Design a protein around this ligand. Sequence first.
Ligand SMILES: CCCCCCO[C@@H]1O[C@H](CO)[C@H](O)[C@H](O)[C@H]1O[C@@H]1O[C@@H](C)[C@@H](O)[C@@H](O)[C@@H]1O
Ligand SMILES: CCCCCCO[C@@H]1O[C@H](CO)[C@H](O)[C@H](O)[C@H]1O[C@@H]1O[C@@H](C)[C@@H](O)[C@@H](O)[C@@H]1O
Ligand SMILES: O=c1ccn([C@@H]2O[C@H](COP(=O)(O)OP(=O)(O)O)[C@@H](O)[C@H]2O)c(=O)[nH]1
Ligand SMILES: O=c1ccn([C@@H]2O[C@H](COP(=O)(O)OP(=O)(O)O)[C@@H](O)[C@H]2O)c(=O)[nH]1
Lengths: 267, 267
Amino acid sequence: YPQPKVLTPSRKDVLVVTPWLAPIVWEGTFNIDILNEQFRLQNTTIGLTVFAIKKYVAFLKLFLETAEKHFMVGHRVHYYVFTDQPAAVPRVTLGTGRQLSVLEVSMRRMEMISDFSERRFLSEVDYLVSVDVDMEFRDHVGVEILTPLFGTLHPSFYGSSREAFTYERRPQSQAYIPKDEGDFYYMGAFFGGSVQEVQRLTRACHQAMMVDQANGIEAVWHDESHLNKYLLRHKPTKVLSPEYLWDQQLLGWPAVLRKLRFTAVPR
Amino acid sequence: YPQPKVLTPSRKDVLVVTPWLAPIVWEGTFNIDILNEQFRLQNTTIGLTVFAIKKYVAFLKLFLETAEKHFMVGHRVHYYVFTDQPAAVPRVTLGTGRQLSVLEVSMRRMEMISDFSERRFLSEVDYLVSVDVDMEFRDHVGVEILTPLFGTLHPSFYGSSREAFTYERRPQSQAYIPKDEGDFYYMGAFFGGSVQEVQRLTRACHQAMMVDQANGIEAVWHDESHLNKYLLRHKPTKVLSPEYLWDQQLLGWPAVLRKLRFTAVPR
Ligand SMILES: CCCCCCO[C@@H]1O[C@H](CO)[C@H](O)[C@H](O)[C@H]1O[C@@H]1O[C@@H](C)[C@@H](O)[C@@H](O)[C@@H]1O
Ligand SMILES: CCCCCCO[C@@H]1O[C@H](CO)[C@H](O)[C@H](O)[C@H]1O[C@@H]1O[C@@H](C)[C@@H](O)[C@@H](O)[C@@H]1O
Ligand SMILES: O=c1ccn([C@@H]2O[C@H](COP(=O)(O)OP(=O)(O)O)[C@@H](O)[C@H]2O)c(=O)[nH]1
Ligand SMILES: O=c1ccn([C@@H]2O[C@H](COP(=O)(O)OP(=O)(O)O)[C@@H](O)[C@H]2O)c(=O)[nH]1
C-alpha cells in the first residue's frame, strides 16, 4: 500500500500511457494487489486460446506448465486448445479453478476465434486472450492486461519510426496503412480483450481477409497486418509493453525490460 | 498525428498513471484530436451540474460564459443549474448543441444529484460532471476527462503524504479512513463519470451522510470526506490533475502546471 507519488513518474525511460490515454503496461506501473482484488470481486474468468497444429503440438507441454505457474494465478482460467491432434495434447495438471478444452480443427486463427467466441466463449469467459503456442511464461502475466481491448508492442519494432513498420503498404489491401499513419506496430502473437471486443476484432479481420482473397491479394504479414489496421482504427484501451512478448535469443535483455514475462522458445 | 514515442516519457516530472492503471490527466499526455473523434463517433452528451444558491447566483454569468469558451466545445452539453432563484439565472448565449435547464431547489449536493440523476439525467446525458459555481474556465476542459468514474487531485494536497490528508479520522464516521491508507486526496469541487457511476457514487455518499447524521456526527470536510472514502473503495478510472482545479491567487502557477484550466474566482 505504498502511497502513489504524484511528483515522481512511475517510469522515466518509457511512455506509460498512449495519446488516447490507454495505459502502456510495464513493470513499475501497477500494483498487482489492487488489481487482483478488483478482478476477484467480479469473479473474472479468463479464456486463453492457443493453436497447436501439426508439429506445433510439441510446444504445448512447456506452454501449459509455465502458464500454470505465471498466467492469471488466483483467477479462473479456461484454456482452449485448437488442434488437429486431440490425443497429442499433454495431460498437464491444473491449479484449482482452471480448465482446458480441446477443440478439434493464414485466415484461420481469426475465423476460428470468431466462430468459437460466438458459441462457447460468451458464455464461458469474461475476457479472451489469444497467443502463439511456441512460447513459454517466465514471469507474471496477470489481470493488469485485462481491458475491453488490447494489443502488444512487437519486440522488434517498439523503437522504430512508423515508416519502418512493416504495415501492409499496397492500397489494394484491406490492411493498407499509409506511410504517414500509425501509432504502434502490434504483434499478432498476443492480443485480447472482453469477449465482445474480441468477437468484433476477429470478425472484422476475418471479413477483411476474405475481401483481400477475393481480390487475389495477401497482406504482407497476414493476420498481423489486419490486426494492425484494426487497432489503428479501433484503438486498444491498453497496450502491453514488450515485457509481454519477447525473444531473448534474438534481442537480449535490454535495460528498459525489468521483466521478460512471455518469451519465444528456441499465422 | 505525431507518432507516439515508446522510449520517451510523456512527462518526466509527474505520475501520469495510477497503480491501478488509471490515467492521470495532464497536458502532454493526450492528443485531443484522437479523443474528440472517439467521443463524436458516439455522439456523446455531457451533463454539467452546478449549484447556485443564495449569493452564489452572482457567479453564474462568468461560469457560463467561460464554460461556453472552454468546456467540451464541439460536443453536446446540457447544463443543469440548481438554484433557489430561477429568475437570477443570467441568459448566456449558448453554442449549437448546448442547452441549460434550471432546476429549482452539507448533505444536499449528493442527495440532489442522486435524485436528478435517477430522473432526468439517464436519459438525457451519457456523462455527468459536477463542479462548484465560483469558478471560471481559462483553458481547455474536454473529453479527455470522460471515463466511467473520475475524481480530481485537490490543488493543496497533491504533493502531500497521506497522513497530512484531511481525511475523516474518527472511526465513528462512515467517511473514516485510517492513517495508513489512502491513494490521493480528491477535491469535492470536480468529479463525474458515466450517469450510472455518478448515480452510484452520489447514492452511496448521500446514504453514508444520513447514517453519520443519525449518529450525531458530521465528517470534517462534509461531502468531500465521503467522496474520498468512496473513491478509496471504488477507484476512479481516471484522475484529473490539478490543472483541472486550481487557485492561482492562493497557489501561484508552479512549473508542473503547463495549463490552468478551471480556477477559483477571487458543501
Ligand atoms: C531471426 C528472424 C528475425 C525476424 C524479426 C522480425 O520478427 C518478425 O516480424 C514480422 C513483421 O515485420 C512478423 O511479426 C514475424 O512474425 C516476426 O518474427 C517472429 O518474431 C521475432 C521476434 C522472432 O521470434 C522470429 O523468430 C519470429 O518468427
Ligand atoms: C486561504 C484558505 C486556504 C485553504 C486551502 C485548503 O483548501 C481547503 O481544503 C479543505 C480540505 O482540507 C477543503 O477541500 C476546502 O474546500 C478547501 O478550500 C477551498 O480550496 C482552496 C484551494 C481555496 O480556493 C479556498 O479558498 C477554498 O475554500
Ligand atoms: O503449422 C502451423 C503453423 C502455425 N501454427 C500456429 O500459429 C502460430 C504463428 O506462427 P509461428 O508461431 O508459426 O510464426 P512467428 O510467430 O511468425 O514465428 C504458431 O505459434 C501456432 O500457434 C500452428 O499451430 N501450426
Ligand atoms: O450558500 C451556498 C453554499 C454553497 N453553494 C454551492 O456549493 C459549493 C461549495 O462551497 P464553497 O464553493 O461554498 O466551498 P470551498 O469550495 O469549500 O470554498 C459552492 O460553489 C456552490 O456551488 C451554494 O450554491 N450556496
